[PDB]
């Protein structure tokens, strides 16, 4: 049971550096190389490190950008990215050589833009709408960076949920989420969207109240 655990998402300013980790466990760290890959919304190979013998190799394209190291004591591989620009915003994965074990990815956002929590607005049907089902929603407006996580009734409403990809404008993201429930359960029972934005360490709950 090999596990590769990467570090959390990072938002950094242009021109800074970042050091992403990949903590390996469940095998002998010095017997396998670790490779790094970049994926921008395709995939590029960055390089590898072989902790056992210290062999490091880079894709020439990444040789003045990336620096790979490994700490044998903690079974952790590191990738430092220097002189960051928006072109470095991407998801980065580590992967064991030959074997199908990958980290979960680390999303890097390189931007000058301020971290902004979302404003969350309830979407209730108009006063004069209406059959056996009703659709409600939440407009999650004005946040940065990505992502947010949306749930309904803390997760207890799972079916009938559509959370749309966010759209970027003026350094802020907006998305919406819809949920469809039986009419016998709303408004007579509560329905609430829960919006977490990790980058600002906030979670906001908005109850959908009839209008």
């Amino acid at each position: 049971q090999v596990q590769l655990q990467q570090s959390d998402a990072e938002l950094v300013k242009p021109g800074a550096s970042v050091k992403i980790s990949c903590k390996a466990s469940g095998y002998t760290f010095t017997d396998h190389a670790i490779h790094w890959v970049k994926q921008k919304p395709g995939l590029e190979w960055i390089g590898y490190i072989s902790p056992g013998n210290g062999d490091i190799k880079y894709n020439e394209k990444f040789k003045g950008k990336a620096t790979l190291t490994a700490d044998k004591s903690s079974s952790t591989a590191y990738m430092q990215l220097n002189s960051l620009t928006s072109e470095d915003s991407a998801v980065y994965f580590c992967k064991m050589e030959y074997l199908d074990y990958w980290g979960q990815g680390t999303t890097l956002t390189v931007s000058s833009g301020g971290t902004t929590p979302p404003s969350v607005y309830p979407l209730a049907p108009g006063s004069a709408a209406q059959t056996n089902s009703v659709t409600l929603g939440c407009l999650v407006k004005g946040y940065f960076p990505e992502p947010v996580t949306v749930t309904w009734n803390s997760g207890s409403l799972s079916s009938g949920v559509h959370t749309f990809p966010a759209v970027l404008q003026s350094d802020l993201y907006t998305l919406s989420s819809s949920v469809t429930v039986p009419s016998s359960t709303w408004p007579s029972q509560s329905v609430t969207c829960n919006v977490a934005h990790p980058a600002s360490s906030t979670a906001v709950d908005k109850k959908i109240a009839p209008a």
Partner: protein, 213 residues
């Protein structure tokens, strides 16, 4: 450096049928080609290595072929869990390089969208903005056209659209359309309509409200 080309961005298949994805190398890469599967937000998963060898634990429904410059991934008896993006990669020489990906699409019976319209919330109006939202949910096929009409006239300025990935359970698509106005602008008109054109109806699907109500 070697260019790996996947000329099909999408490939559509019914569940239970066979689909093949192609990949071309710009120069010889021998049999040092792998294939990967990737679902949204997840790492890739190895399917094939050495062009034709199945990675351990991968269903025997997956096969690979080719040598030199022309490679194919074949999936027999396609299953719902195969909905994913598929990538080839060469590792014959450094730097390793990947194809651009092919997304599978699953065929299903036509389904009409469920359309819902929402006035701006009271909360939003307090800060001076007014977003009107329309959801067009659980439809197939994926092509759909949405028009906003304000007191009868079409409006595009201020409209932002977003589309979900194909649903992994029911193979439908959903869309949101959001028309953002100022509060003053919003309050100068009455009828707001989201109108969808989809092959499931010869007549547009219309949802509306009148602000004045």
């Amino acid at each position: 450096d070697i260019v790996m080309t996947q000329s099909q961005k999408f490939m559509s298949t019914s569940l239970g049928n066979r689909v093949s994805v192609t990949c071309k190398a710009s120069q010889n890469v021998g049999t040092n080609v792998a294939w990967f599967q990737q679902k949204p937000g997840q790492s890739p998963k190895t399917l094939i290595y050495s062009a034709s060898y199945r990675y351990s634990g991968v269903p025997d429904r997956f096969t690979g072929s080719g040598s030199g410059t022309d490679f194919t991934l074949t999936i027999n008896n396609v299953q719902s869990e195969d909905l994913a993006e598929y990538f080839c990669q060469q590792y014959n020489s450094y730097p390793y390089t990947f194809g651009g990906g092919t997304k599978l699409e699953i065929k299903r019976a036509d389904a009409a969208p469920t359309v819902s319209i929402f006035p701006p919330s009271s909360e939003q109006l307090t800060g001076g903005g007014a977003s009107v939202v329309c959801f067009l949910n659980n439809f197939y096929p994926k092509d759909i056209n949405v028009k906003w009409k304000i007191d009868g006239s079409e409006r595009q300025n201020g409209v932002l659209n977003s589309w979900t990935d194909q649903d992994s359970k029911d193979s439908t698509y959903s869309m949101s359309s959001t028309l953002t106005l100022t509060k003053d602008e919003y309050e100068r008109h009455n009828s707001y309509t989201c109108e969808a054109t989809h092959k499931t109806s010869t007549s547009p699907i219309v949802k509306s409200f009148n602000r004045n109500e």
